[PDB]
């Protein structure tokens, strides 16, 4: 504590930084000899100084973003001559939405694809990876196939630009889609015809295209191409999968936090849990992410099948008796929701 300080400073006008975002966490894997281990980047100015300039430019590409910059960026650095599975094993603990590795060989790409699919299908954690040239048939991975992009007289390979693609996806609000979003920094791309681009989109690739006097994303589809009776076409859109994953994460969070191993498995507690889930869905409806008139309800058929499997005598039992029958430590539920999609095709017929 010194004398009272009254200082008026004069300085030049400074450029205004792009606005931050509330959602979107990207995990980046890098190879450099120093500053190993996990690193955090909220602002583009705060980068480790000892890192190489090429890695710094990768991080800058990631932080480029969209209408909002991504919420935060997790950078994991390894020396080199180190297996990617060690980084994956460390990254299982953390939470993230999109993961990218600029310097992946085909073995690393295969390992990352297998890790992502195992996490989504077995570990029950909804995460995504942006990869260069992978023919994976899963909604988790996004296949970005566009080579030799020019960014200010510098050439970036197909694996190198996945950082910019992941940053662009993370910076998009939930209402919007990345279809036809233009890249001002890109100056040129290799020539491609309409038929080839259409076939590539039909095969499940996300590409760059020249249209309406700019370069923009052709379509926002993921790599899923084989459709089953229950999967459907709606699962091929990035926006739909994103909102579904958000819903899954929130519901699993509340369920784990408040009910697993916490209360006895009675019918009243099942009703309370139903009420909590319904209230969350109502909040989501108010936020305009999903359509109104969603329902949550005890699953009667699954409970009946489980009771039959357990060998109890289901005959001479009333519907209320089956509904409120004890079921050990299991809970059966079902719900119904509805989600919309953005405008992407328009037909205008004019009579002259």
């Amino acid at each position: 504590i010194g004398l009272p300080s009254i200082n008026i400073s004069f300085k030049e006008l400074a450029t205004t930084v792009k606005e931050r975002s509330a959602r979107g966490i990207i995990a980046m894997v890098l190879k450099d000899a120093k500053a190993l281990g996990l690193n955090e980047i909220h602002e583009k100015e705060d980068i480790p100084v000892d890192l190489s300039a090429e890695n710094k430019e990768y991080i800058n590409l990631a932080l480029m973003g969209n209408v909002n910059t991504p919420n935060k960026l997790l950078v994991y650095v390894i020396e080199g001559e180190a297996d990617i599975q060690t980084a994956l094993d460390f990254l299982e603990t953390k939470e993230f939405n999109y993961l990218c590795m600029p310097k992946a060989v085909e073995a690393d790409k295969t390992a990352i694809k297998n890790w992502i699919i195992k996490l989504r299908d077995i570990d029950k954690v909804k995460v995504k990876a942006v990869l260069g040239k992978v023919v994976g048939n899963h909604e988790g991975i996004i296949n970005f196939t566009t080579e030799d992009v020019l960014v200010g007289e510098k050439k970036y390979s197909v694996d190198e630009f996945t950082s910019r693609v992941a940053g662009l996806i993370a910076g998009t609000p939930l209402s919007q889609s990345v279809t036809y979003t233009k890249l001002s920094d890109v100056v040129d791309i290799p020539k491609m015809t309409k038929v080839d681009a259409e076939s590539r989109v039909n095969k499940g690739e996300l590409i760059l295209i020249k249209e309406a006097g700019a370069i923009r994303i052709a379509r926002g589809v993921n790599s899923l191409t084989e459709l089953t009776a229950e999967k459907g076409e709606m699962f091929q859109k990035i926006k739909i999968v994103d909102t579904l994953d958000i819903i899954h994460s929130d519901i699993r969070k509340v369920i784990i936090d408040d009910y697993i191993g916490k209360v006895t498995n009675s019918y009243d507690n099942k009703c309370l849990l139903i009420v909590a889930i319904k209230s969350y869905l109502e909040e989501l409806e108010k936020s305009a992410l999903i359509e109104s008139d969603s329902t949550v309800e005890i699953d009667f058929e699954a409970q009946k099948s489980y009771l039959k499997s357990k060998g109890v005598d289901l005959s001479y039992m009333t519907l209320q008796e089956i509904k409120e029958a004890n079921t050990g430590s299991k809970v059966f539920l079902k719900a119904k929701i509805k989600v919309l999609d953005a405008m992407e095709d328009i037909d205008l017929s004019i009579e002259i």
Partner: protein
């Protein structure tokens, strides 16, 4: 089919307020009152009505055992913030066909009873409220 045993008795009623079970509840009540407008149509002698909406009204009565409502709403009511609650009512009579379990949402109370006692009289608290939404579970 209609027997006097099937008439539901209020002794088999249970209430959950803000996720906690109340055991001193004495009575629970919730109703929707529709708003109607009279409309006279030329050539018709009988007057008809048009439906506008509803207002949810109800009340709770419970024995004075603990200061449940003070902790629920007092300090917030002073500070200028009005909380909203969810109530679950259950009615399961053993001699009835089934149970009835309704959830009442967006509940706003009408007052907060600080003190009410008279010599030689046991304690009771009445709490009216209003609501907007509801959901059906286990209908008959």
């Amino acid at each position: 089919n209609m027997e006097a045993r099937n008439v539901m008795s209020g002794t088999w009623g249970e209430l959950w307020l803000d996720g906690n079970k109340v055991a001193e509840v004495k009575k629970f009540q919730a109703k929707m009152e529709f708003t109607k407008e009279d409309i006279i149509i030329a050539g018709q002698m009988g007057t008809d009505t048009k439906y506008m909406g509803y207002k949810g009204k109800g009340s709770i009565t419970l024995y004075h055992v603990s200061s449940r409502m003070h902790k629920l709403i007092g300090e917030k009511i002073k500070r200028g913030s009005e909380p909203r609650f969810v109530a679950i009512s259950k009615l399961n009579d053993p001699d009835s066909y089934g149970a009835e379990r309704i959830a009442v949402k967006n509940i706003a109370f009408d007052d907060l009873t600080l003190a009410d006692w008279e010599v030689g009289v046991k304690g009771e608290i009445e709490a009216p409220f209003t609501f907007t939404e509801y959901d059906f579970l286990d209908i008959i």
